[PDB]
Amino acid sequence: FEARRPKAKAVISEIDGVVRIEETEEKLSVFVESEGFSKEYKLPKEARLLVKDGDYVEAGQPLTRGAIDPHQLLEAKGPEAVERYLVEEIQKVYRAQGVKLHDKHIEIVVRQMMKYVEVTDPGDSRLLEGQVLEKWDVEALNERLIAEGKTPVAWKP
């Protein structure tokens, strides 16, 4: 509920690609290789893996075991993925303790968590790069600027 980076944080892929393991007797790394890109994820030697070598992993798919950083999942895979993840992970606890509870309420709260956005390009507006505001307000401003024919604001969730 606080959207905190977990202590036992799982490592997720920033892009798509194929798995290439490279494990020396003393160190370990995982490489996701695209058609023309390659990402290196140097992780400690004793971390559990979820990726069989030479597999195709989605962006934001977990490589290591553990809890996913919701902000990393947001950057990698987008808002729908984070909403799915938060709702399911909270429900896991509640089902484990034997508590029946409707996704409706958790979704309400998550909706309030996804309430704001961050400007990446002000366009023709008075806003600033990095300024935080509400999704509703930036969408209203962008609709008014598209009506005026101006460049809308580029915003990130």
Partner 1 sequence: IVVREADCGTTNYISVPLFQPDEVTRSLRLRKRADIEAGLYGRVLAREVEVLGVRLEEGRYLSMDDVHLLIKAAEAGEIQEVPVRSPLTCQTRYGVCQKCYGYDL
Partner 2 sequence: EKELLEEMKHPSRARRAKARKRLEVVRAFLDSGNRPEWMILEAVPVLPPDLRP
Partner DNA sequence: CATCCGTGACACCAGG
Partner DNA sequence: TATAATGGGAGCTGTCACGGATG
Positions touching partner 2 (CB under 8 A) are 128-131
Question: What DSSP element (H or E) covers 140?
Answer: helix 135-147
Interaction of residue 110 with partner 1, rule CB under 8 A: yes
Strand partners, 117: 133
Query: From partner 1, partner 2, DNA, none, which one binds at residue 131 (CB under 5 to 8 Å depending on kind)?
Result: partner 2
Interaction of residue 156 with DNA, rule CB under 7 A: no
Q: How far is the CB of 32 from partner 1 (least distance, A)?
A: 18
Interaction of residue 19 with partner 1, rule CB under 8 A: no
| CA separation, residue 102 to residues 64, 92, 129 (Å) | 30, 12, 39
Candidates 5-13, 20-28, 93-101, 118-126 — which segment interacts with partner 1 by CB under 8 A?
93-101
Interface map 122-151 toward partner 1 (x if CB under 8 A): --------------x---------------
Interaction of residue 4 with DNA, rule CB under 7 A: yes
Q: Is 88 left (phi over 0), alpha (psi -120 to 50) or beta?
A: alpha
HEC-encoded secondary structure of 34-76: CCCCEEEEECCCCCCECCCCCCEECCCCECECCEECHHHHHHH
Q: Which long-range contacts (CB under 8 A, 24 or more apart) does 108-111 make?
A: 109/1, 110/83, 110/86, 111/83
CB of 4 or CB of 144, closer to DNA: 4
Scan residues 6-35 and list those touching DNA (CB under 7 A). Answer: 7
Q: How far is the CB of 149 from DNA (least distance, A)?
A: 36
Interaction of residue 65 with partner 1, rule CB under 8 A: no
